[PDB]
C-alpha cells in the first residue's frame, strides 16, 4: 500500500535543500 518512487526522492531532496 505504501508507494515509493523517484518523486518521493526529489521532494525529499528539495525539502532538504530549501530548508
Amino acid at each position: 500500500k505504501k508507494k515509493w518512487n523517484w518523486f518521493d526522492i526529489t521532494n525529499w531532496l528539495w525539502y532538504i535543500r530549501k530548508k
Epitope: K3, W4, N5, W6, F7, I9, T10, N11, L13, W14, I16, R17, K18
Partner: antibody, heavy 132, light 110 residues
C-alpha cells in the same frame, strides 16, 4: 513485462467530444506517472499531457496546444488511464499513445528537487480523426 | 517555450556506417534531453535520457552526447533494425513543455 491496451477514439465531427482509455497491467500502476503523446498525419510527436499519482494529488499537466480543452484522469482501482477530449478541432486528428512515464532524480545539489522525465513505455496507439 | 530543431531531417546510410543526428535547443537545457526511436506502424521506443544515459535493453550502438543547447545521437555500426525515425525531446521546464524535435528519418543508401 508491461502491457498497455488502448481503446476508444474513432471519428468525431469538429466541436465534439471523445474519451480515450488505456488499461495497464504488469507493473504497479498506482506508483507510476502516466501520460499521452500524439502524432498528426505527416507530422512528428507532440506531448499531450501527464498525470501524477493520487498521493501526489493526481495533478494533470498539459501541452499548450490542448490546455483548457483536454483533461487526463486515472482510476487506480481498475488500472485505467483516460484522456477526455472536448471541443475537438481538425488539427487534433492523429495517433494517440498512452505512456508509462518515469523520472530519475538529479543529484547535483543545486538541482535537488528536479528530475529527468521521459516516456518509458508506449502503447500501440489509437487513431483519432476529427472530420465532418 | 523551448523549440528543438533536429538536423538532418533525413539521411541515407548503409549497414555498418556511423550516422550522427544533431539536436539544437533554443536555450540552454543542461542535460535534460531524451532520444526516442520510431518505426512505421510501430510504437515509439525510448533510447536515452539525461542526454547520455542509455535505457535498459538498448544496444550500445546508440550513444548520446552534448550539453547546454547542442546534442547528438550517434549510431555506430548501423544495423538493419536501426532504419527508423529518431526524435529528441527536451524535459527542462518545471512547468512541462516536453517539446520534441521534428524527427530524423534514416534511410537505406543505394
Amino acid at each position: 513485462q508491461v502491457q498497455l491496451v488502448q481503446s476508444g477514439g474513432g471519428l468525431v465531427k469538429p466541436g465534439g467530444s471523445l474519451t480515450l482509455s488505456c488499461s495497464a497491467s504488469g507493473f504497479f500502476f498506482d506508483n507510476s506517472w502516466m501520460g499521452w503523446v500524439r502524432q498528426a498525419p505527416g507530422k512528428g510527436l507532440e506531448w499531450v499531457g501527464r498525470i501524477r499519482r493520487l498521493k501526489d494529488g493526481a495533478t494533470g499537466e498539459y501541452g499548450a496546444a490542448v490546455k483548457d480543452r483536454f483533461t487526463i484522469s486515472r482510476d487506480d482501482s481498475r488500472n485505467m488511464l483516460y484522456l477526455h477530449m472536448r471541443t475537438l478541432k481538425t488539427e487534433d486528428s492523429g495517433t494517440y499513445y498512452c505512456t508509462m512515464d518515469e523520472g530519475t532524480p538529479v543529484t547535483r545539489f543545486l538541482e535537488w528537487g528536479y528530475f529527468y522525465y521521459y516516456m518509458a513505455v508506449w502503447g500501440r496507439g489509437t487513431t483519432v480523426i476529427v472530420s465532418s | 517555450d523551448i523549440v528543438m530543431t533536429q538536423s538532418p531531417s533525413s539521411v541515407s546510410a548503409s549497414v555498418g556506417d556511423r550516422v550522427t543526428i544533431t539536436c539544437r535547443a533554443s536555450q540552454n537545457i543542461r542535460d535534460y534531453l531524451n532520444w526516442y526511436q520510431h518505426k512505421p506502424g510501430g510504437s515509439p521506443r525510448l533510447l536515452i535520457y539525461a542526454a547520455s544515459t542509455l535505457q535498459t535493453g538498448v544496444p550500445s550502438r546508440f550513444s548520446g552526447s552534448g550539453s547546454g543547447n547542442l546534442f547528438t545521437l550517434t549510431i555506430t555500426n548501423l544495423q538493419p533494425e536501426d532504419f527508423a525515425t529518431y526524435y529528441c525531446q527536451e524535459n527542462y521546464n518545471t512547468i512541462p513543455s516536453l517539446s520534441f524535435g521534428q524527427g530524423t528519418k534514416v534511410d537505406i543508401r543505394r
